[PDB]
Amino acid sequence: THWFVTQRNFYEPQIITTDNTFVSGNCDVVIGIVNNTVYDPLQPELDS
Amino acid sequence: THWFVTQRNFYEPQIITTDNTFVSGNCDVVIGIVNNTVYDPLQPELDS
Ligand SMILES: *[C@@H]1O[C@H](CO)[C@@H](O[C@@H]2O[C@H](CO)[C@@H](O)[C@H](O)[C@H]2NC(C)=O)[C@H](O)[C@H]1NC(C)=O
Numbered sequence: 001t002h003w004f005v006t007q008r009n010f011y012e013p014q015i016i017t018t019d020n021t022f023v024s025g026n027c028d029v030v031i032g033i034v035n036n037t038v039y040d041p042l043q044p045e046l047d048s
Numbered sequence: 049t050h051w052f053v054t055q056r057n058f059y060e061p062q063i064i065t066t067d068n069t070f071v072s073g074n075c076d077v078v079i080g081i082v083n084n085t086v087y088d089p090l091q092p093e094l095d096s
């Protein structure tokens with residue numbers, strides 16, 4: 001049900017954030033891309 | 049005219065930000081250092 005990002009050689013699930021991932025292109029080009037939510041750690045810091 | 053940062057093996061220009069670069073030293077030591085503007089993605093989030 002949930003999506004995580006792990007190191008390749010050892011299972012260690014982390015919450016998918018903007019500090020784990022980078023942005024390039026859009027979803028109309030990558031084959032097999034999946035919808036999910038990426039957590040932004042700066043948003044609740046701004047809100048609080 | 050403009051300055052970008054790209055991976056060395058494939059031309060893919062990106063906006064020079066504090067997440068693409070690291071700070072060390074000052075302008076008076078590096079030979080050939082060039083003036084430019086480094087974008088900070090946190091400033092417009094703080095301002096908005
Ligand atoms: C991922 O979400 C996007 C929208 O956030 C979905 O794209 C939509 O597709 C439906 C049906 O084709 C359209 O009614 C919407 O107008 C589309 N929105 C956009 C922004 O394109 C996409 O289908 C979702 N991906 C999957 C496979 O679930």
Ligand SMILES: *[C@@H]1O[C@H](CO)[C@@H](O[C@@H]2O[C@H](CO)[C@@H](O)[C@H](O)[C@H]2NC(C)=O)[C@H](O)[C@H]1NC(C)=O
Pocket residue numbers: 083
């Ligand atoms: C980069 O911009 C700085 C200004 O922020 C320039 O530094 C000035 O240049 C001359 C002296 O070299 C005078 O305007 C000031 O005394 C300098 N300021 C400081 C604090 O160094 C610098 O010359 C510019 N570099 C280039 C090549 O344009």
Ligand SMILES: *[C@@H]1O[C@H](CO)[C@@H](O)[C@H](O)[C@H]1NC(C)=O
Pocket residue numbers: 031032033
């Ligand atoms: C994987 O292959 C199946 C066919 O067995 C297809 O239905 C599915 O869309 C494919 N998914 C991706 C990400 O290529």
Ligand SMILES: *[C@@H]1O[C@H](CO)[C@@H](O)[C@H](O)[C@H]1NC(C)=O
Pocket residue numbers: 079080
């Ligand atoms: C590069 O070479 C030119 C001569 O063609 C010289 O004017 C310039 O100062 C040099 N710059 C550096 C950083 O060595």
